Amino acid sequence: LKGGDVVRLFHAEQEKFLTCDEYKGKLQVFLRTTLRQSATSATSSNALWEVEVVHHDPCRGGAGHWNGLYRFKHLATGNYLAAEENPIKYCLVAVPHGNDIASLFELDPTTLQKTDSFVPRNSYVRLRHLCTNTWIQSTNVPIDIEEERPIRLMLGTCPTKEDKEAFAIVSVPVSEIRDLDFANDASSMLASAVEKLNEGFISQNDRRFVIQLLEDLVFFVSDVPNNGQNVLDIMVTKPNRERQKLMREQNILKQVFGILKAPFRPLVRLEELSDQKNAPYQHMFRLCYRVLRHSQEDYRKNQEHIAKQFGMMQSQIGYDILAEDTITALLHNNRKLLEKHITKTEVETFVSLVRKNREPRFLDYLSDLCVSNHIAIPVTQELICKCVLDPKNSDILIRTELRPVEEEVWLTWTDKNNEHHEKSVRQLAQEARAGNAHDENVLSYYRYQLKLFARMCLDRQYLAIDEISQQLGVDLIFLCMADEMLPFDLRASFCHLMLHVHVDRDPQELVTPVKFARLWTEIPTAITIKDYDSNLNASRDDKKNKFANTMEFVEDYLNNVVSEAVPFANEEKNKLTFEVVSLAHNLIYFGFYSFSELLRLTRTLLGIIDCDIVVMETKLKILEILQFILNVRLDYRISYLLSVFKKEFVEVFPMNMNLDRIGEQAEAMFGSMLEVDDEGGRMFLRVLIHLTMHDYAPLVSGALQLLFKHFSQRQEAMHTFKQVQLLISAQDVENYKVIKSELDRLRTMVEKSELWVDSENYQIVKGILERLNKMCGVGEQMRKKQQRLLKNMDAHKVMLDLLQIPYDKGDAKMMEILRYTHQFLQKFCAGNPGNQALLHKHLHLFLTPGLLEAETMQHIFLNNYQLCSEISEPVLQHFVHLLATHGRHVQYLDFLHTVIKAEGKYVKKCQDMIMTELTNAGDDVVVFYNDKASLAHLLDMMKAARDGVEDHSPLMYHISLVDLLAACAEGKNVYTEIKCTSLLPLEDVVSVVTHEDCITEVKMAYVNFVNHCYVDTEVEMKEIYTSNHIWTLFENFTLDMARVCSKREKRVADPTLEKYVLSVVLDTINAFFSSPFSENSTSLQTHQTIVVQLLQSTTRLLECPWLQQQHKGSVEACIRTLAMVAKGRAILLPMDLDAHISSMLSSGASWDYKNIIEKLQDIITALEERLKPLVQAELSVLVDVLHWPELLFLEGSEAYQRCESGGFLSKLIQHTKDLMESEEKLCIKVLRTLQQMLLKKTKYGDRGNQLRKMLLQNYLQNRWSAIAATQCRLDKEGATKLVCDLITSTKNEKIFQESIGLAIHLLDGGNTEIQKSFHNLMMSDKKSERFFKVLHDRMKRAQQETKSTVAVNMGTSVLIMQPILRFLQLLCENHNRDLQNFLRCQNNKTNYNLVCETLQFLDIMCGSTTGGLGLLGLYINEDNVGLVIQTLETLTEYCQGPCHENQTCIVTHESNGIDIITALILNDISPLCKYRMDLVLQLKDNASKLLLALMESRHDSENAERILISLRPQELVDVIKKAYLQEEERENSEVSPREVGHNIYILALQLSRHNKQLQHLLKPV
Ligand SMILES: O=P(O)(O)O[C@@H]1[C@H](O)[C@H](O)[C@@H](OP(=O)(O)O)[C@H](OP(=O)(O)O)[C@H]1O
């Protein structure tokens, strides 16, 4: 560290960054809080700090020493950090000048330092203020409490020193400093311009200088080298988020806003902008607006800062300032901001201005405003509709008509002069071809008006769809789109309108291609494609009656496109083909096209996309179409197999099956006619491979998904069949029919939401919901059957849409309908994890600020440990934020209570997050009555509710809060137990308990609190056993038991009181008396009478006949513990009561539905068994295709060259890297496929081999060494870099595991090229530290978990070790000295010793000191024997070569792993050898190998004596002799005890050179 260098100070405990900012006009220093998930990423320019050194010469900075005074300066404000009297005694603030001792500071090192050596950068230090001799500290008191959710935190000083107040230094790149300085200069120039504007006098040259400033700022913001384009029209491909944030914090946006506002405040006027005098001012406003547009691109914070000014841009609209385009961009960026900004006056202004200009371009602004992210916004849509469809704006809308004149289309428009002109469309198009400017202008205006109508009608806006449909008929639209004279763009507009108005309408409904649940009677005996399509042919024809000719047009147009030599030669036709393909996709998904027609169309589509944003989108849509056709084919296959099953069942049982006969037809089905393409699959697969190469990410993802699915047809169909459901019983058939009808009606009503929202529709929907509630049924098994039926029906999506329906809080009828819907969802999710998964998929909608949907979410999360594991901190945060904002009722707490527990299992992480959030929120969310006055208020409410407690009472809210807190206490969790102890004192608990009259439920809650937070403490609490709160609680408990018994004697008793006692009091008493901590209680001699009375109360409780049998047994166990405690606590029992206690001790010592189902299940199982090998046979074909993609493409093509160069594989690897974060499943699939490619070839049996031969012959034309060649090819293509990047950056366990597996497979065989590539990557790359740190951290976590399980008595952390150790062994295989030395010393800034980590792992696994003592038999079991063997092999690989440094490290490590290594040989491993002796022999052999490798080539004796110290020669000789004799008892196995003994003998011979006794013993008779 040197003076004049800028760095950042970071707090470890607080995980926050110090900063200085002008909160309310005054500069203040604070520890800003960050809501990000990565503290290191919370870096701001204003948080930069500079270090200044104090020297004798004021101009001399030099380099700071550990004993030199230091000062902290702000790189932006320039003020210096200092401490001043706090109105904590001193508070940190910023001063303008450093000419005072206050700014002086010193850095106390946290660790040892090299005397007065220069301070190293990025070293922990503690700030100390020498001016007043006070130590800096951190506090949670905010400085900006005035604002909700404060971020600024106070940093005071303490007279004493605290070791936790350590600040870490972080370096800063020169780029940040340069950007900050340039931004400051630009801000100064902008301030000068603002001063000129405020003065109202500015020279022409000065204004030109301002324009030049704006141009330079435009260049800087664009970040694109200037190419001569206008700054106003500058184009930026991607903005820089850091630069935008720098501008925002510098307030350059504020400067621009002031520059725009001040002239109109005048120096300039909006009307006067037309004047040449104010033309340069208008140009400067335009520059400001373009700069704002570039600044706010893709930045929500900048968008919010602009929204703060939304008023001024709204006023600026209607003037030549590009406000329209800027506002449209900003509004399209975010939908919520659009909902805030949009207003009816703004819509009217847009209509008025577009009318004023009579230009097409205005309409585009409204068109873009209508939709965002291509997703419609109902409010803006309706607002635009209301203004557009009004007759007043009929002038702007060009009316069109069809007249015979066989038919012709005419257009009438109105000019600004009000003159009306009407012309034929065909004549207008011909005049356009001629080139008339007016005709072109009217055509463009017409096109933009149709585009605006289409965007208005987007997402089924029936409020305005009707009028537009009436104005433009289907026949008119088809005539227009069929007309050839019309330009391609206008035809495309007509096609888009046709798609978005008529085709997408109520009569049409999205059809799910695959139906899981079918009826047995429905199944046809004989099935063909025609029979399959006959199921809904009548409905298809009925719907076709309206749009029949359009399908003919689309089919013919696609035939023409495929016939065309070059598909995408012309862009004007590219637009039209995009529109036509989109229309085809919508028609297909609406189901107009039959299965045979879809198969016919697949050929044309694949030809079109078989050998530009529009082209890429067209290809993507065609891929989606193909996916739909393939899934329809899957459904057809399922139906055919079901038909075969029906035929066989009918034959056998008219009222022994030929399973082989069924299986033959099943195999034949998979295989002909079903094939999408004529070639037989080659066309499709080639299309997919070619698409994978293209740049577009969604296109590549879809191509890869289709390619993977194409080679897994059989397994998917088998899964679908196993999930098929059959209806055979009349009751369930009737239920299915009723559900279908009700769902159809409900879907229609939801679709016409717009019409029936505000009627009879309300009552109809309420009746439908009641019928559904009755339909859901009762009975657990009946419930699961009905849930399966409902999931098959797919009504969940309909109900989710019903919830999505918009509404106003005033509609109580719609509230009741929502309650019915929530009950329906509850019944769907009632004890069904499968259904709950579907709900979690769409949970994003469920996250709303409402009690009823919160309860529904609770019921969704009920009993799902998978969902608890995958829970999200942001979701929990938003829940606690809901509590903080409102905290109205207990349902919020009940949700958290449900989340806490799952399957009677504890998740420590969620509990910790809940406790932390509760503490951070503080008294606002947590309300406690600890204070006497608050307890008095609680007493008042308790007395009011003494007769009864209301279901929404604040008393019950407090009780629920207490229960929630105790639930977090469950689990003997020390970390949260400390917080609970801080939260609530036993003295408050005793006060409230000892109150004369208390609520029974409150008492249960507090006893539960005691049971969890205090009794179940992991760490002994001294206050518990040094305090009398527990004895006061026990006397109260005994009084309560006496009350319960007297009540039952009186025949009048309170179930709440009885439940309180039985449940909480008994458990607390038993836990206390069985507590190991309480075994040393020394006040029991004083409370002898109290404890004896408690035991008497328990005796009476057991004597009571009313006590339940389960309660009786639990009480008997508790009383056994009570007596065991009572033996020696200075308590003498009465004679009769002692006899009764002895009796207690004695007691403690004392057509066929089911036939059809079974037949189907047996057939499914037989088919699965038969087709098991063919699945792998098909899968292997994908590996062969990936190995040889070029054979697919005709030789001599450009694709052939690219494939031969390995381009396809490299693109696959790079795309895997790019998509690891977005499509984790596809990333994992690609990684596993790469592993399969690397793996050795394996035979698949006779049938599998035949299938593979046929598949390869059809797909391809015909055109350890192999493993090494494949490994080298993958390394060249970039597999090594992909693996390194994944291992460094992935946060997914599956991704990490697959990456490590790919590494192991690549390195298999000790490939020197792969090892050298890994070494080069690690050494050259800057992420070597990240890679090694990830591996070392995983190893350390596994070691910690291993210690935990050893203490307890096998964990993903341990299981992940095997691949990591294998990877390290393979890296060091073949005695690679470079790698072996690198692992020990990476020579990086932080060096992690993987060798010592492995040795420590072995030590902890074997038991460390106890293992050395010789408890290896107990410590090692069958499960971990493989891991121990792998660790020993890895250590041997490290040692061999020989690596002298590694050998010395292992022998001299402080863990004494050598002791365990030798103990392994000597110890018998008795528990294991009895059952699995071969593993013990292998362990001993590996240990001997490691010991020999340790002294491979060490001439010195140091290692020999170190080994001999633990390994006495006599034991070694006895082991060798024992092994030789045990040879005879050998059983069949690869390991040989004679070989093990020979290796041990060789080790003994090597050791004997330094030991005379060993030599003498080894000498034979
Ligand atoms: O990823 P998102 O949705 O944008 O949210 C980010 C983050 O969650 C915070 O809102 C904010 O950090 P602070 O809380 O530290 O302000 C940050 O802005 P920033 O770049 O101004 O920090 C955001 O970008």
CA 329 to chain centroid, in Å, comes to 29
Rounded Cα distance between 1437 and 1457, Å, is 16
Q: Which helix (H) or strand (E) holds 7?
A: strand 5-11
1472 CA → ligand 1 middle, Å: 57
Rounded Cα distance between 613 and 574, Å, is 10
Interior angle at CA 331, CA 325 and CA 336, nearest 5: 175
43 CA → ligand 1 middle, Å: 11
Residues 6+ apart with CB under 8 A from 20: 27, 28, 29, 30, 46, 47, 74, 77, 79, 81, 94
8 A C-beta contact, residue 1446 and residue 1395: yes
Amino acid in the structure at residue 83: A
Annotated ligand binding at 599? The verdict is no
* Of residues 366, 238, 223, the one with CA closest to residue 297: 238
Rounded Cα distance between 1491 and 1157, Å, is 63
Rounded Cα distance between 853 and 861, Å, is 12
The DSSP call for residue 499 is I
CA 1056 to chain centroid, in Å, comes to 44
Beta bridge pairs of residue 671: none
Amino acid in the structure at residue 820: Y
8 A C-beta contact, residue 1410 and residue 1419: yes
232 CA → ligand 1 middle, Å: 30
Q: What does the buried/exposed string (b/e) look like for 40-57 if buried means 16 or more CB atoms within 10 Å of the residue's CB? A: eebbbbbbbbbbbbbeee
Annotated ligand binding at 32? The verdict is yes
1514 CA → ligand 1 middle, Å: 70
Annotated ligand binding at 42? The verdict is no
Protein residue whose Cα sits closest to atom 5 of ligand 1: 36
Rounded Cα distance between 1085 and 1105, Å, is 32
Tokens of 824: 């329906």
Rounded Cα distance between 444 and 388, Å, is 19
219 CA → ligand 1 middle, Å: 26
Tokens of 1479: 């593993």
Amino acid in the structure at residue 1102: L
Protein residue whose Cα sits closest to atom 13 of ligand 1: 34
Residue position matching structure tokens 């060096």: 1391
36 CA → ligand 1 middle, Å: 7
- Its sign, for the CA torsion 1514, 1518, 1524, 1527, is negative
Beta bridge pairs of residue 105: 70
Rounded Cα distance between 1098 and 708, Å, is 68
* Of residues 448, 432, 450, the one with CA closest to residue 440: 432
Residue position matching structure tokens 């503080």: 922
Check pocket membership of 36 for ligand 1, CB cut-off 6 A. yes
8 A C-beta contact, residue 1488 and residue 1541: no
Rounded Cα distance between 288 and 191, Å, is 14
Protein residue whose Cα sits closest to atom 22 of ligand 1: 42
Rounded Cα distance between 958 and 966, Å, is 12
Q: Which helix (H) or strand (E) holds 9?
A: strand 5-11
Protein residue whose Cα sits closest to atom 6 of ligand 1: 36
CA 740 to chain centroid, in Å, comes to 36
Protein residue whose Cα sits closest to atom 3 of ligand 1: 300
Probe residue for ligand 1, chosen from 44, 147, 297, 301 as the CB with the greatest number of ligand atoms within 8 Å = 301
What's the half-sphere exposure (Cβ side, CA atoms, 13 Å) at 389? 20
> In 10 A of CB 420, how many CB atoms?
11
* Of residues 681, 592, 609, 598, the one with CA closest to residue 633: 598
Cβ-based burial of 982 (10 A; exposed 0-12, middle 13-18, buried ≥19): exposed
Tokens of 596: 């045979």
The DSSP call for residue 568 is T
Rounded Cα distance between 363 and 444, Å, is 11
37 CA → ligand 1 middle, Å: 10
Rounded Cα distance between 952 and 229, Å, is 67
253 CA → ligand 1 middle, Å: 18
8 A C-beta contact, residue 1438 and residue 1373: no
CA 1390 to chain centroid, in Å, comes to 31
The DSSP call for residue 41 is G
Annotated ligand binding at 110? The verdict is no
Annotated ligand binding at 1563? The verdict is no
249 CA → ligand 1 middle, Å: 13
DSSP 1342-1364: HHHHHHHHHHH---HHHHTHHHH
Amino acid in the structure at residue 1172: K
By three-state DSSP, how is residue 16 classified? strand
Tokens of 798: 């309909």
Rounded Cα distance between 70 and 169, Å, is 14
34 CA → ligand 1 middle, Å: 8
8 A C-beta contact, residue 135 and residue 157: yes
Looking at the chain, after which residues does the C atom sit over 2.5 Å from the next written N, breaking the chain? 87, 265, 405, 611, 655, 671, 758, 1150, 1263, 1353
1295 CA → ligand 1 middle, Å: 28
Cβ-based burial of 652 (10 A; exposed 0-12, middle 13-18, buried ≥19): exposed
8 A C-beta contact, residue 641 and residue 666: yes
Q: Which atom of ligand 1 is nearest to the CA of 248?
A: 21
Check pocket membership of 1127 for ligand 1, CB cut-off 6 A. no
> In 10 A of CB 979, how many CB atoms?
18
3-state secondary structure 1487-1509: HHHHHHHHCCCCCCCHHHHHHHH
* Of residues 43, 102, 109, 106, the one with CA closest to residue 241: 43
By three-state DSSP, how is residue 889 classified? coil
Rounded Cα distance between 74 and 561, Å, is 66
DSSP 602-658: HHHHHHHT---HHHHHHHHHHHHHHHHHHHHHHHHHHHHHHHHHHHHHHHH------
- Its sign, for the CA torsion 367, 373, 375, 378, is negative
> In 10 A of CB 263, how many CB atoms?
22
The DSSP call for residue 483 is -
Check pocket membership of 241 for ligand 1, CB cut-off 6 A. no
By three-state DSSP, how is residue 1304 classified? helix
Check pocket membership of 34 for ligand 1, CB cut-off 6 A. yes
* Inter-helix orientation angle 1293-1307/1279-1289, to 10°: 150
Rounded Cα distance between 927 and 918, Å, is 11
* Of residues 497, 478, 635, 631, the one with CA closest to residue 551: 478
Q: Which helix (H) or strand (E) holds 171?
A: strand 167-171
Strands (DSSP E) contained in 1312-1440 are: none
1189: preceding bond cis by omega (within 30 degrees): no
Rounded Cα distance between 79 and 68, Å, is 21
Rounded Cα distance between 1086 and 662, Å, is 84
By three-state DSSP, how is residue 979 classified? helix
Amino acid in the structure at residue 1550: Q
299 CA → ligand 1 middle, Å: 10
Annotated ligand binding at 751? The verdict is yes
Annotated ligand binding at 1274? The verdict is no
Annotated ligand binding at 84? The verdict is no
Check pocket membership of 149 for ligand 1, CB cut-off 6 A. no
Rounded Cα distance between 1050 and 1043, Å, is 10
By three-state DSSP, how is residue 1057 classified? helix
Protein residue whose Cα sits closest to atom 8 of ligand 1: 36
Check pocket membership of 35 for ligand 1, CB cut-off 6 A. yes
Check pocket membership of 1241 for ligand 1, CB cut-off 6 A. no
Protein residue whose Cα sits closest to atom 16 of ligand 1: 34
Tokens of 64: 């700071």
* Of residues 1396, 1380, 1370, the one with CA closest to residue 1439: 1380
Rounded Cα distance between 1366 and 1363, Å, is 5
Amino acid in the structure at residue 35: L
8 A C-beta contact, residue 104 and residue 97: no
The DSSP call for residue 136 is E
For the chain, the maximum distance between any two Cα atoms, rounded to a whole number of angstroms, is 129
1119 CA → ligand 1 middle, Å: 59
Q: Which atom of ligand 1 is nearest to the CA of 42?
A: 15
Determine how β-strand 408-414 pairs with β-strand 70-74: unpaired
Q: Which helix (H) or strand (E) holds 376?
A: strand 375-376
Protein residue whose Cα sits closest to atom 2 of ligand 1: 300
Residues 6+ apart with CB under 8 A from 579: 492, 495, 496, 499
Rounded Cα distance between 1437 and 1395, Å, is 11
Helix residue spans in 1108-1206 (DSSP H): 1109-1126, 1135-1149, 1153-1187, 1198-1204
R_g of the chain computed on alpha carbons: 40
Determine how β-strand 517-519 pairs with β-strand 725-727: parallel
Cβ-based burial of 1152 (10 A; exposed 0-12, middle 13-18, buried ≥19): exposed
Residues 6+ apart with CB under 8 A from 400: 409, 410, 411, 412, 425, 471, 472, 476
* Of residues 1159, 1303, 15, the one with CA closest to residue 646: 1159
* Of residues 1116, 1105, 1124, 1115, the one with CA closest to residue 1149: 1116
Rounded Cα distance between 237 and 219, Å, is 13
Protein residue whose Cα sits closest to atom 1 of ligand 1: 36
φ, ψ for residue 224 (rounded to 5)?
-105, 130
By three-state DSSP, how is residue 141 classified? coil
Annotated ligand binding at 248? The verdict is yes
Cα–Cα distances in angstroms (integers) from residue 1186 to residues 109, 378, 1177, 1180, 1201, in the given order: 58, 47, 15, 10, 15
* Of residues 645, 605, 654, 657, the one with CA closest to residue 626: 605
1227 CA → ligand 1 middle, Å: 28
Check pocket membership of 245 for ligand 1, CB cut-off 6 A. yes
Q: Which atom of ligand 1 is nearest to the CA of 241?
A: 20
The DSSP call for residue 757 is -
919 CA → ligand 1 middle, Å: 23
Interior angle at CA 169, CA 163 and CA 171, nearest 5: 170
Residue position matching structure tokens 């009656």: 545
Rounded Cα distance between 135 and 157, Å, is 5
Rounded Cα distance between 530 and 1449, Å, is 77
Cα–Cα distances in angstroms (integers) from residue 1046 to residues 497, 1093, 1094, 1134, 1140, in the given order: 83, 16, 16, 22, 20
> In the chain, what is the straight-line distance between the N-terminal and C-terminal CA atoms, in Å?
73
Check pocket membership of 247 for ligand 1, CB cut-off 6 A. no
* Of residues 877, 820, 1006, 1019, the one with CA closest to residue 930: 1006
Q: Which helix (H) or strand (E) holds 882?
A: helix 873-885
Q: Which atom of ligand 1 is nearest to the CA of 35?
A: 14
8 A C-beta contact, residue 686 and residue 1208: no
120: preceding bond cis by omega (within 30 degrees): no
Rounded Cα distance between 1180 and 1186, Å, is 10
3-state secondary structure 443-476: HHHHHHHHHHHHHHHCCCCHHHHHHHHHHCCHHH
Probe residue for ligand 1, chosen from 10, 31, 36, 303 as the CB with the greatest number of ligand atoms within 8 Å = 36
Residues 6+ apart with CB under 8 A from 436: none
Annotated ligand binding at 301? The verdict is yes
Annotated ligand binding at 747? The verdict is no
41 CA → ligand 1 middle, Å: 10
Rounded Cα distance between 869 and 1356, Å, is 14
Check pocket membership of 301 for ligand 1, CB cut-off 6 A. yes
Check pocket membership of 877 for ligand 1, CB cut-off 6 A. no
Residues comprising the chain, all counted: 1565
By three-state DSSP, how is residue 43 classified? coil
